[PDB]
């Protein structure tokens, strides 16, 4: 039968144009006040999944 | 620890606030500082200390 | 009572003598000004020396204290 997408991963990643995966950064949910402005700003844009982890994400997101 | 988290609130009606911390037992007054508000894009007096 | 240690900071020299660096390139990670900043070298808040200009790393001893200075000579 059809592979089941890992639904939790479908909510954290989105496929880019050259097959990569964009994700929101960690450490910006709460406890924001002790964190420097500069650290918070660099965490606001979406980063791309690194090479070591694209296998895990692609495994989890087959129909992406 | 002792020191407690506060929000410094813009007087420009924007809703923009900073966040910082204060010791309440010492210096029990209201922290008032001029800070950049990025809605009206001017430096503005901010007011609160809980 | 004697089983703790800190993770190591990977300090020290990252770009050696004559090494062609781009601007922004960290040159030394250090605790304090073991090396001081010279021409086209900035000293950051953690006292790490970084390049302000593209060019060649140059170590030199200067001044009445014989302090160690780092500069970038534009090639």
């Amino acid at each position: 039968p059809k592979i089941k997408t890992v639904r939790g991963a479908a909510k954290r990643f989105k496929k880019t144009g050259k097959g990569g995966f964009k994700h929101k950064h960690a450490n910006l949910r709460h406890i924001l006040t002790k964190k420097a402005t500069k650290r918070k700003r660099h965490l606001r844009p979406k980063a791309m999944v690194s090479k070591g982890d694209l296998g895990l994400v692609i495994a989890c997101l087959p129909y992406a | 620890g002792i020191r407690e988290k506060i929000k410094l609130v813009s007087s420009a009606g924007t809703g923009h606030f900073y966040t910082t911390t204060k010791n309440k037992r010492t210096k029990p007054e209201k922290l008032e500082l001029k800070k950049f508000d990025p809605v009206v894009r001017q430096h503005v007096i901010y007011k609160e200390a809980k | 009572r004697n089983g703790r240690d800190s993770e190591a900071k990977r300090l020290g020299v990252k770009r050696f003598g004559g090494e062609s660096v781009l601007a922004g390139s960290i040159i030394v990670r250090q605790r304090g000004t073991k090396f001081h900043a010279g021409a086209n070298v900035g000293c950051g808040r953690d006292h790490t020396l970084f390049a302000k200009a593209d060019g060649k790393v140059k170590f030199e001893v200067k001044g009445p204290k014989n302090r160690k200075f780092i500069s970038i000579e534009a090639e």
């Binding site: 939790g8 909510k11 929101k24 960690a26 982890d53 895990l56 | - | -």
Partner: protein, 96 residues
């Protein structure tokens, strides 16, 4: 996704965004497609007849992909600037 019990990446990272229901009823159209309709006119409904856009698409947009080499009338659709000019440069009559 199991990484040995380390908090795996799909849960270590935060959820983001929502899904718009509008995006699913909104289709892009290439200039190459404007010749595939019967009659020169390019409405949302004659694009469905030519299997360019889905049968449940309510909103359609012509973008600058490919080329149009024909006088084409586009009605009730949206048109990019770049696409608007390629249509106008070939006998085009865009009608809101």
């Amino acid at each position: 996704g199991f990484e040995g019990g380390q908090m795996p990446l799909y849960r270590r990272l935060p959820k983001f965004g929502f899904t718009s229901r509008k995006a699913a009823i909104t289709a892009e159209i290439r200039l190459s497609d404007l010749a595939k309709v019967e009659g020169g006119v390019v409405d949302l409904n004659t694009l469905k007849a030519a299997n360019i856009i889905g049968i449940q698409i309510e909103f359609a947009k012509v973008i600058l992909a490919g080329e149009v080499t024909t006088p084409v009338t586009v009605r009730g659709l949206r048109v990019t600037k770049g696409a608007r000019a390629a249509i106008e440069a070939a006998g085009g009559k865009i009608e809101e």
